[PDB]
Design a protein around this ligand. Structure first.
Ligand SMILES: [Mg+2]
Ligand SMILES: [Mg+2]
Ligand SMILES: [Mg+2]
Lengths: 509, 508, 508, 508
């Protein structure tokens, strides 16, 4: 009754997937832990099974990866870049089937699944160039006959824990950068996206093996919280990049700090869009729609708070409602479908609870609010007005398509309301005012890691660094100098002079 | 009996110090906490007293600094730079007396006390140029009609906790950089260097007042573990820079992580010098001496492990012995003194405890090992041979002048022995081999934040980032792009068109 | 009869000037060339005299500068930075009197003379930080056991030729940056600002001599085109920085290219302000007046073309006329004066010819256009409407206060009209439209080196690189990575291994 | 009779070459100028014909390129990078056969022809990443309410003139970087490598056309000095990159400077290897062999001067002689041939003339000196001893495999001898001495653009900047921030505040 055994889903075998798949890769494939079945959220049918990592699997994989690092760290960074280039090409070859798997197992629509693989392809191209560039300055020493250089070297083993919402691209961001920086990687993806993790690992493994490199350079140990906690506690995991909930990520950060490791934390968002009175409303409405209902509201960068100037609030809300009602719902792989299911049945439960807590806290559901009567985890995208900006349910991240709409009047108050939540990921204003734009970008503006103008809160490109502040965890991924998080800086002074130190009254020999 | 009440120490009043000083500054001076008396470690006589911060003082001061931040962050960075330049000048004007106070209260010799103030002067002058440079790149967006810019803005309030060993310059590094980055600062120095903290704050306060700026931009709350723990748990302290022991730093790091704050940790070191067979011994011997015994072995960067190749181990030890004999010991102000007292009597007990462990773990004290029979906290600079590289006492940071000497044979093993400890601050090799030097600097080389060649472990100027790895805590101060730790990065996309192209070409 | 021999001007002696001054400094003061008298342009009275450089003075000075380079290039950059810091302080000590000299000998108002000196002080402070920063990246070699480093090194002797309009700051920009980059300098300022060049060189000479450094590090050879041309042709002048007219700059650039030297050319401007229909007119009118009449229209960055959208053209012109009428004219050192003389009587003649030519090409003088009946080189600041944007006189740089005003309708054409002239220095639009601003800053916008929004064409700050494109010569000064022009880049590969892998995997 | 019509050479048609080829590409293929036939230097047989550009072709091509720029500059840099990525893949798919054509028409051996194409692939990969990174800093303005940004924008049309010795990679370095920087390109390669220029342009033109882009973005006008001079004089050529002889480049540099254009000049080398007494001779001898005889001594980076310490001179020469006699000579496209012909018959004559001149000036031919007894342009790689370092022939660049060997004793003199020539391209020392290595890299060391240690003068990687100093012309290509030469910097201040300027007494 598995989908991978039906003729309609035969394309799954193009990714090398079968009925029961090995979920551990360290140069050899295996898995002696619990066997997990993952389900298609569009119909709740089982897709295939994955043999997860036992503790012994984890132990042997970490040892094999660090052994492989001895080889990988001796490979010049530009030649490491060549490997990442080939990974990029291998992803290009499978972009459609891999994107389809993302839609099938995770549940986002096909263009977003394909677009997510593109992000990995993109960062591969970026990292290839970066592999000729990473380093530090040679600085002028104040000492005659001395050189002063800043060196950068790999940290060693980078553990990468990822969430269900971006089950390819977040790993890819960490993988391409960590790789060209000379690290080996160990991946534990979200258990409900295990087939995606296995499929991505198969693509990378072939490139490694085809280049006669040890496969443990890009190791995989599928598992749940047990394997993730072990990574957080493991002194052999030199850097732990964690992407997920603030609640779990706070414990991961503490465990890593306890052992003086390095952590890279990419945690929750509660992202606000602010529409000022001079906003182009033909930009505001489609932008708010995509940011709120894209990926069925399950992006870290999803717009969950919509602030609209009181003069235009009612008009925007009425246009947004008319917009929501035109969204095409269906199977995420089907043509022209813009809205699919939530990732889990539990997510449907959380969705309903938040809607009820909103009405209790004084909110009015003006669109949606209910589960859809159809197979899968489909709920209606939801718009709630009338809450106070500081209502509890508005300050918590609910990973579901619920948009809280607030009125405002004053720029200073609404900037403060953007910043008042514990999260600090993304933020957008819609305005034409030149000075307001530069205030929003300045020290009294948005406190978030992503600070946008006249575009939504979601859909970043790879050239810049990606991440957030406050409870979002502080880590950065992808562009700018995010690579430095994957390496260790040393400040190096070389005395090449024959000059002796000042004897200071001591008679040396 | 207070030294400040003796005419011999009247120069103290040139720093604004009195018998009883206020240890809280936030624009106004006060202090309702416990009154601490600090003592001169060269004679154990009381210098003067400082009224420390109560909880109410700390609450009041945090609030005033954060209000002051609203004014300060609005001042353009180059103009903040001009303030820091004036701080640099104000330190210059008092470098001799402030250096003397550092020698008096902390105990290092005058040239190091003066040189420590010069480090603060130097970072001011560096930060002035930086105040015109900080920012991020403008980047080419993949989308037409979009701008992509990386912005850097202040985090807000930078708490600064410092240790006794560098009671001026570590604060200075953090203050100069944090100020030009548009933050306000709150300083809690080591209790046993409270007068130094008050004196530095008096100097900065006059500059702020003279420029009609709120003095809380550089706030001070003298106190001990109670104030420091408050800062570590205080969500209003956006960045907590902590310089101190690994044991305390670990708890601070945990408390900051628990509240999703930012920390910059500068913790312990167990720094090694490695002398290969081809080393210039005329370079090795003085380098090792001044790295081991400088500041009476009380620097985070002090050389505590000396690895000498088998072929030259005996000669280097014999030459180092003959050199230790000529270390001139006296009061830290006595002209041409090289070696003063340890900071506390507890430091002496730790010194003796370590010498005793080393002798019982199989080491030989070839020089020193004894308390000096004189007033103050004086111990003999000490060299121990015969220990194994992995002896328990050698892997511990004993903050005292004990140099553990080891033999080695091969480059691979001694590199491993450098890296085998928990700390990761400073490291040095002495060699002429070109390949070995670049291997030391590379991915299979030293694992430390500071990686030196033919200079000891205290080779560090302000142009580079200063800090260590592993249990040293990972933070960086001073130069390179260390300033980014004092700011928050934003990635900013500006759509100035009338279109909505999505990243990665996604058609919704 | 000489102003320096009068009591009202005895403050000139504070700069060490006397009746007849040596105009050559190379560690010794001298001058065997012609003795020039410089005159106060506000009253045409002689100030003092300067002995200029002969060819033999020049020859000896170049040799001594290059000899001093052997010592100076061996001084670490941060310590060269400290020298520049002290120059900054010495300038600070004399800022009021040196500014007064600038107003007296050159003719700009006092706030601008002091402002010009402040710019030199500012770049000194900037350069002190930069002296711990200059250098290049260490890059990852594609080859095992190889290091790849970008080194930067001084080019050697930097000759600096400057113009009358900024007789302190242009040299200061070049001097501070060239010095921290490890070069020696040789300055030939404008003959009509010789006393300014001497006064500045006296200040720097004192700093060098107090530091026991060879004075030829900052050499001076006062003279005219003969000395300037000798520099342009001299293989021993490794970099020639030239600030001046496009006509002379083109010949200098060719002479330097002929000998495969390096030139940094800062030439003429023909700078446009554009006011769109949505512009803040309370912002446009004062910005245009300052940019047009500041320095009596004698800045390279002076606004010389004003494009106004046809909807607001008449209103802006009328408002600008009302503001011109209130410009306060008088002695440039008088503290209430906004507008002083032109620098020379030939400048007045060129002004009159351009007004004449503007009338003959169909322009209307709506304000000014006349020489003033008073001592000194005073002309009325002038506004001309009615010329076509491509009128020949509008495309010429006349270094005088004549502002040509044009109507326009659409953004596309007025951006082209900004770009159509041969000059490429500075440019400004006034608008509120977000997209227009980013189009202005993009590849189809302004082609100038300075591209401003809602501020006039003049008054840049030192944090950015300063200079222009096209006939402005391409050079940059001051901020960003302008310092690279004063240094030579080397790409350095060091094989520290025992193998010889070849680039690109070539198996030979 | 044409090689391309013999089945032996049928692989040439895989590059799209025919008996007669169009040598103009601007979206369409043409060529109404002189038809040239290029010859295989290995056997003096004609290969195929190329129709070169007439003046009318050149005119029409410049116009279409500048029209195409209006489209190309509006394409975001990352999307321009994606085109360059596809060019890289296109070159990958043709690397063996394109390199084979380089070997056939130019004459370098197969691994070098392939490696040259690999360089182009390498710079494509680099440029793709760079397309996400080009730009400047956002800087902190000293003024409240103002932003300060450094923008970079394309210059427009980049003319690229290249030499026969690297008929692929030099163009590739310029094309990939100029393309991602938003420029269009116009290529005029060496007439004797026209088939290579056509083959490369066919590869690129397919990529542009496949991406629905105007082909004039990468235009081609094959021609001689007349087309090259037109580009040098053409105001529409915003940047002219010229690679070739100092003699021609000097005139190109002066022509471009006359019109205030931009030039990037990559001219001759006279590169020296210096082997000190402590050198590893197992590295010296193979490195000198590859550097001197690679490409039959026809690289700008070829080693022409070999300085050997007196103590090891005779042994190194003896070992070099033995190494020379072992290289396999043959047709350069045959695998495992190590030594091919010179590029022209004239080059053979100039080789003989230089050998003759070396004998006249007192040199001894210790190896080689004669033409080889085989078809094609083959000469013996040649070693000359006994000349003085200042011998006229040693200071002339002769583009043939003649290596001049000199004795030296002292470091300072031999660095001076490295620096005494007019060229400043590449340089290398062989030594183990740490201090000597950093002095070589320092201000008193090599004056060249490429400063190597324990590797030869030739065979650079792409990650750093490539070029030289002095008569080498100063340009840089490829890595580091060489891309800035293909763009114009603007310093942009944006007043976003409502603050109106100070009235200064005027009633506005
Ligand atoms: Mg969850
Ligand atoms: Mg303690
Ligand atoms: Mg030729």
């Amino acid at each position: 009754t598995l989908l991978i055994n039906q003729p309609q889903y035969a394309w799954l075998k193009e990714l090398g997937l079968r009925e029961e798949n090995e979920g551990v890769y360290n140069g050899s494939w295996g898995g002696r832990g619990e066997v997990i079945t993952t389900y298609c959220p569009a119909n709740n049918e089982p897709i295939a099974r994955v043999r997860q990592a036992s503790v012994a699997d984890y132990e042997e994989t970490v040892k094999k990866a660090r052994e492989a690092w001895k080889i990988w760290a001796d490979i010049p960074a530009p030649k490491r870049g060549e490997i990442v280039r080939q990974i990029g090409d291998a992803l290009r070859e499978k972009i459609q089937v891999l994107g389809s798997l993302v839609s099938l197992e995770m549940g986002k629509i096909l263009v977003e699944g394909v677009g997510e693989v593109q992000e990995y392809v993109d960062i591969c191209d970026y990292a290839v160039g970066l592999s000729r560039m990473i380093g530090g300055p040679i600085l002028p020493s104040e000492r005659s006959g001395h050189a002063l250089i800043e060196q950068w070297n790999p940290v060693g083993l980078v553990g990468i824990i990822t969430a269900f919402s971006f089950p390819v691209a977040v790993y890819g961001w960490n993988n391409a950068i960590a790789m060209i920086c000379g690290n080996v990687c160990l991946w534990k993806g979200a258990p409900t996206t295990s087939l995606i993790s296995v499929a991505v690992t198969k693509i990378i493994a072939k490139v490694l093996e085809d280049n006669k490199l040890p496969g443990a350079i890009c190791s995989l140990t599928c598992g749940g919280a047990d394997i993730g906690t072990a990574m957080a506690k493991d002194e052999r995991v030199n850097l732990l990049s964690f992407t997920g909930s603030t609640q779990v990520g706070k414990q991961v950060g503490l465990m890593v700090q306890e052992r003086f490791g390095r952590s890279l934390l990419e945690l929750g968002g509660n992202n606000a869009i602010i529409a000022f009175e001079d906003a182009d409303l033909s930009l505001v409405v489609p932008s708010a729609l995509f940011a709120a209902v894209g990926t069925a509201g399950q992006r870290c960068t999803t717009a969950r708070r919509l602030f609209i100037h009181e003069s235009i609030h009612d008009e925007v809300v009425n246009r947004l409602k008319k917009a929501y009602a035109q969204i095409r719902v269906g199977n995420p792989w089907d043509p022209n479908v813009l809205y699919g299911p939530l990732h889990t049945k539990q997510a449907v439960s959380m969705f309903l609870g938040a809607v009820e807590e909103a009405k209790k806290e004084g909110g009015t559901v003006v669109y949606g609010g209910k589960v859809m009567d159809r197979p899968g985890n489909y709920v209606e995208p939801t718009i709630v007005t009338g809450l106070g900006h500081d209502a509890s349910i508005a300050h918590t991240e609910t990973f579901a398509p619920i948009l809280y709409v607030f009125k405002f009047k004053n720029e200073e108050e609404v900037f403060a309301w953007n910043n008042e939540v514990k999260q600090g990921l993304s933020s957008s204003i819609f305005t034409k005012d030149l000075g307001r734009i530069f205030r929003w970008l300045g020290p009294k503006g948005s406190d978030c890691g992503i600070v946008n103008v006249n575009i939504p809160t979601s859909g970043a490109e790879i050239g810049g660094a990606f991440g957030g502040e406050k409870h979002t965890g502080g880590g950065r991924e992808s562009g700018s100098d995010a690579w430095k998080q994957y390496m260790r800086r040393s400040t190096c002074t070389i005395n090449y002079s024959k000059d002796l130190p000042l004897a200071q009254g001591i008679k040396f020999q």
